[PDB]
């Protein structure tokens, strides 16, 4: 519509939740599998959300108009931050813990025990609490994720500037959105964009962990998550 209609970004976000129902598969009745390890249950959620991630990107205006190989690149380059941003925002509804797409709730102490505390605490303090405090809505989250998706620095892009232009259109639509919805707060736009530095550092550290839960194996992970982990 307007290059980057904020209504369609919200619809992309809404179309690929949760949102009721999806919160019972393994949180109060049943639960296929039976993995004894928080890292396992999380890697399973990541793997599952990888499929929904593709569909989400397809609903982001102009993503699908890029060459097919460019889309692959963009997703291989941004999947972990995109996934981390989703569950972090989803976890605003819970205290000291994270809500996976599989409807499973991972508590702080479990993560600390599993040995992944610290990285878990950073997620909770640098991402989840920051989103809660400023109460970022789903449209804003959607725009931030779209900004991540449209990374012109990804290696191999056929037209980097075309990607940069798309990212800038999101900058414009989001800013306009903030001024219309939150006129009371002049600095909300910047505060939204400053949520990204922590998303990137936490994502990099996370990738660092994954590349260890692999170069050791012992009861492997799921296909796709493993495919994305073949390095960019």
């Amino acid at each position: 519509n307007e290059d980057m209609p904020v209504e369609r970004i919200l619809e992309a976000e809404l179309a690929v939740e949760p949102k009721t129902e999806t919160y019972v598969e393994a949180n109060m009745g049943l639960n296929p599998s039976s993995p004894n390890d928080p890292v396992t249950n999380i890697c399973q959620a990541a793997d599952k959300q990888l499929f929904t991630l593709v569909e989400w990107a397809k609903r982001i205006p102009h993503f699908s108009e890029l060459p097919l190989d460019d889309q692959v690149i963009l997703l291989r380059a941004g999947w972990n931050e995109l996934l981390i941003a989703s569950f972090s925002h989803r976890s605003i509804a819970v205290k000291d813990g994270i809500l996976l797409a599989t409807g499973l709730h991972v508590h702080r102490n479990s993560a600390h025990s599993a040995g992944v505390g610290a990285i878990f605490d950073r997620v909770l303090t640098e991402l989840v609490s920051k989103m809660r405090d400023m109460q970022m809505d789903k449209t804003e989250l959607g725009c931030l994720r779209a900004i991540v998706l449209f990374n012109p620095d990804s290696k191999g892009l056929s037209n980097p500037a075309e990607v940069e232009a798309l990212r800038e259109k999101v900058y414009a639509s989001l800013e306009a959105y903030c001024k219309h919805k939150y006129p009371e707060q002049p600095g909300r736009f910047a505060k939204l964009l400053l949520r990204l530095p922590a998303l990137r550092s936490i994502g990099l550290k996370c990738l660092e962990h994954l590349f260890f839960f692999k170069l050791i194996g012992d009861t492997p992970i799921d296909t796709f998550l493993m495919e994305m982990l073949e390095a960019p």
């Binding site: 990888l50 397809k58 495919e227």
Partner: peptide, 10 residues
């Protein structure tokens, strides 16, 4: 990348 490339071309 089998999965990703496949999922995107449908």
């Amino acid at each position: 990348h089998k999965i990703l490339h496949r999922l995107l071309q449908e």
